[PDB]
Write a protein that holds these residues in place. Structure first.
Motif, mmCIF file in Angstrom:
data_model
loop_
_atom_site.group_PDB
_atom_site.id
_atom_site.type_symbol
_atom_site.label_atom_id
_atom_site.label_comp_id
_atom_site.label_asym_id
_atom_site.label_seq_id
_atom_site.Cartn_x
_atom_site.Cartn_y
_atom_site.Cartn_z
ATOM 1 N N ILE A 149 21.118 -15.665 -53.910
ATOM 2 C CA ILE A 149 20.361 -14.964 -54.965
ATOM 3 C C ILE A 149 19.609 -16.045 -55.756
ATOM 4 N N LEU A 150 20.279 -17.146 -56.068
ATOM 5 C CA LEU A 150 19.598 -18.236 -56.855
ATOM 6 C C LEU A 150 18.365 -18.771 -56.116
ATOM 7 N N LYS A 151 18.386 -18.867 -54.800
ATOM 8 C CA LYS A 151 17.196 -19.328 -54.046
ATOM 9 C C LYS A 151 16.046 -18.358 -54.322
ATOM 10 N N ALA A 152 16.288 -17.030 -54.291
ATOM 11 C CA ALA A 152 15.241 -16.024 -54.580
ATOM 12 C C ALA A 152 14.744 -16.150 -56.017
ATOM 13 N N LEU A 153 15.656 -16.281 -56.982
ATOM 14 C CA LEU A 153 15.272 -16.343 -58.400
ATOM 15 C C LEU A 153 14.536 -17.667 -58.694
ATOM 16 N N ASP A 154 15.028 -18.805 -58.212
ATOM 17 C CA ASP A 154 14.269 -20.051 -58.480
ATOM 18 C C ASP A 154 12.884 -19.915 -57.857
ATOM 19 N N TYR A 155 12.814 -19.299 -56.674
ATOM 20 C CA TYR A 155 11.518 -19.081 -56.017
ATOM 21 C C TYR A 155 10.633 -18.207 -56.892
ATOM 22 N N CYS A 156 11.083 -16.997 -57.260
ATOM 23 C CA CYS A 156 10.198 -16.085 -57.998
ATOM 24 C C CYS A 156 9.859 -16.675 -59.367
ATOM 25 N N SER A 174 9.599 -19.826 -60.078
ATOM 26 C CA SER A 174 8.654 -20.955 -59.796
ATOM 27 C C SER A 174 7.260 -20.390 -59.540
ATOM 28 N N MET A 175 7.216 -19.137 -59.064
ATOM 29 C CA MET A 175 5.949 -18.414 -58.786
ATOM 30 C C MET A 175 5.457 -17.651 -60.030
ATOM 31 N N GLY A 176 6.057 -17.835 -61.195
ATOM 32 C CA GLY A 176 5.622 -17.209 -62.446
ATOM 33 C C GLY A 176 6.057 -15.772 -62.592
ATOM 34 N N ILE A 177 7.114 -15.353 -61.910
ATOM 35 C CA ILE A 177 7.536 -13.927 -61.896
ATOM 36 C C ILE A 177 8.982 -13.790 -62.370
ATOM 37 N N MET A 178 9.170 -12.852 -63.305
ATOM 38 C CA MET A 178 10.530 -12.484 -63.769
ATOM 39 C C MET A 178 10.880 -11.185 -63.033
ATOM 40 N N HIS A 179 12.082 -11.088 -62.464
ATOM 41 C CA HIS A 179 12.497 -9.865 -61.726
ATOM 42 C C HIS A 179 12.757 -8.729 -62.719
ATOM 43 N N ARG A 180 13.585 -8.971 -63.738
ATOM 44 C CA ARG A 180 13.829 -7.980 -64.830
ATOM 45 C C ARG A 180 14.677 -6.777 -64.383
ATOM 46 N N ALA A 187 9.297 -6.022 -62.172
ATOM 47 C CA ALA A 187 8.980 -7.459 -62.275
ATOM 48 C C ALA A 187 7.667 -7.658 -63.026
ATOM 49 N N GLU A 188 7.544 -8.816 -63.658
ATOM 50 C CA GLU A 188 6.331 -9.090 -64.438
ATOM 51 C C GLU A 188 5.980 -10.555 -64.334
ATOM 52 N N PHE A 189 4.724 -10.829 -64.604
ATOM 53 C CA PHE A 189 4.187 -12.202 -64.689
ATOM 54 C C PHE A 189 4.546 -12.774 -66.047
ATOM 55 N N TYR A 190 5.128 -13.954 -66.050
ATOM 56 C CA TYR A 190 5.468 -14.711 -67.255
ATOM 57 C C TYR A 190 4.205 -15.444 -67.753
ATOM 58 N N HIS A 191 3.778 -15.094 -68.956
ATOM 59 C CA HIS A 191 2.719 -15.807 -69.706
ATOM 60 C C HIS A 191 3.297 -16.266 -71.040
ATOM 61 N N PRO A 192 3.254 -17.570 -71.340
ATOM 62 C CA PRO A 192 3.841 -18.055 -72.578
ATOM 63 C C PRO A 192 3.237 -17.366 -73.802
ATOM 64 N N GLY A 193 4.103 -16.877 -74.670
ATOM 65 C CA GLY A 193 3.754 -16.219 -75.939
ATOM 66 C C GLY A 193 3.621 -14.736 -75.777
ATOM 67 N N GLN A 194 3.673 -14.225 -74.539
ATOM 68 C CA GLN A 194 3.485 -12.778 -74.302
ATOM 69 C C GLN A 194 4.743 -12.021 -74.738
ATOM 70 N N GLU A 195 4.530 -10.902 -75.405
ATOM 71 C CA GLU A 195 5.593 -9.969 -75.823
ATOM 72 C C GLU A 195 5.723 -8.879 -74.768
ATOM 73 N N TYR A 196 6.923 -8.726 -74.266
ATOM 74 C CA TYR A 196 7.227 -7.808 -73.163
ATOM 75 C C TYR A 196 8.003 -6.627 -73.714
#
Ligand SMILES: Nc1ncnc2c1ncn2[C@@H]1O[C@H](COP(=O)(O)OP(=O)(O)O)[C@@H](O)[C@H]1O
Ligand SMILES: [Mg+2]
Ligand SMILES: [Mg+2]
Lengths: 330, 8
Positions: A141-148, A150-156, A180-189
């Motif tokens: 699972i950690l391989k998938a999460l570090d991958y996603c 690293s690709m700017g994606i939070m599973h959520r 899942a969503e794209f991580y942008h610094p400062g963005q409110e989710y």
């Protein structure tokens, strides 16, 4: 201003989407090229939710077994987000493969076609896993999460039903990228994400400027449930009781310290149900039926995932470096 | 026999 929550940035992969071409993260601009719905015939029902019905199917063009995710009505915007994220992450370690995208000409109901995984229901599988097997699958699972991440994606929505395991093959796939969503610094989710038992404290205290570390709280909930044979581990009756169930184990001192650090306004309906709680020792959950799954390395790893402060949690790559995984043959 | 456009 003085009443704002205090801002937060991911400690890792902070700016990865900033430096991508816009088309990578701008899913609203994505255009679908529809496949042929007639390629796919339903064989068996596998799962059904508020958002989807899922079938085992045959691709009649190649006799391949596939999975069809029939999407319940939602904004077109959310359908493009799941598709774009699956295309962005396709071929990554332990990420489910999107094969095709089709639509009912009559009802206009869209459907995602996936790689089939021969899953075993977690309610049967998890109680059979050895200490080795738990460490092995947690590492997958950690391989998938570090991958996603690293690709700017939070599973959520990290939880057992979104983790497919073909145990014959020791094959794991992280599925369900619909939240899942794209991580942008400062963005409110939106805090109304994930599933109650796996929701991080940030979601329960309504802190919107969260990041990849949400997934690491969820993963901790999974690990606790597994090693202690207690599913779910934090069994709240609602979002408010969920935080009380957490606070009864991790204590309220670190919770109030968290709320104070980020100037979070606690919904005042917590005022009468939360109180003050001692931090319990992870040892209260160990017993004759689960002791073989529990080790000092397991409890240390869990303690480093289940932290109120999202910034304090292990990242997926920091977790991969934990002593708990030294025995996993890599 | 059909469900959301797909043949059984
Ligand atoms: N590729 C797959 N292989 C096997 N089962 C799957 C697959 N994709 C989904 N499922 C099953 O269907 C369920 C619902 O799919 P999921 O993508 O999680 O939809 P939702 O977003 O509605 O939860 C899963 O929890 C799982 O049981
Ligand atoms: Mg799901
Ligand atoms: Mg989902």
């Amino acid at each position: 201003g003085s009443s704002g929550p205090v801002p937060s940035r991911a400690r890792v992969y902070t700016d990865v989407n900033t430096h991508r071409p816009r088309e990578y993260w701008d899913y609203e601009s994505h255009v679908v090229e529809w496949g042929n719905q007639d390629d796919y015939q339903l064989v068996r029902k596998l799962g059904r939710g508020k958002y989807s019905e899922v079938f085992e199917a045959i691709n009649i063009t190649n006799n391949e077994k596939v999975v069809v995710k029939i999407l319940k009505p939602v904004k077109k915007k959310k359908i493009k987000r799941e598709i774009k994220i699956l295309e962005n992450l396709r071929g990554g370690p332990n990420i489910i493969t999107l094969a095709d995208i089709v639509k009912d000409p009559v009802s206009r109901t869209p459907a995602l076609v996936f790689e089939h995984v021969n899953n075993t229901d977690f309610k049967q599988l998890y109680q059979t896993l050895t200490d080795y097997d738990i460490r092995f699958y947690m590492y997958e699972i950690l391989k998938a999460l570090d991958y996603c991440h690293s690709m700017g994606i939070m599973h959520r929505d990290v939880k057992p039903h979104n983790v497919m395991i073909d145990h014959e093959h020791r094959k794991l796939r992280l599925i369900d990228w619909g939240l899942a969503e794209f991580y942008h610094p400062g963005q409110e989710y939106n805090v109304r994400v994930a599933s109650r038992y796996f929701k991080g404290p940030e979601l329960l205290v309504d802190y919107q400027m969260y990041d990849y570390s949400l997934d690491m709280w969820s993963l901790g909930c999974m690990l606790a449930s597994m090693i202690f044979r207690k599913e779910p581990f934090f069994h709240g009756h609602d979002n408010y009781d969920q935080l009380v169930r957490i606070a009864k184990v991790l204590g309220t001192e670190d919770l109030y310290d968290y709320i104070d650090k980020y100037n979070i306004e606690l919904d005042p309906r917590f005022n009468d149900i939360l109180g003050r709680h001692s931090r319990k020792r992870w040892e209260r959950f160990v017993h004759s039926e689960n002791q073989h799954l529990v080790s000092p390395e397991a409890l240390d790893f869990l303690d480093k995932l289940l932290r109120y402060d999202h910034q304090s949690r292990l990242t997926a790559r920091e977790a991969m470096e934990h002593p708990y995984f030294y025995t996993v043959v890599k | 026999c059909r469900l959301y456009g797909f043949k059984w």
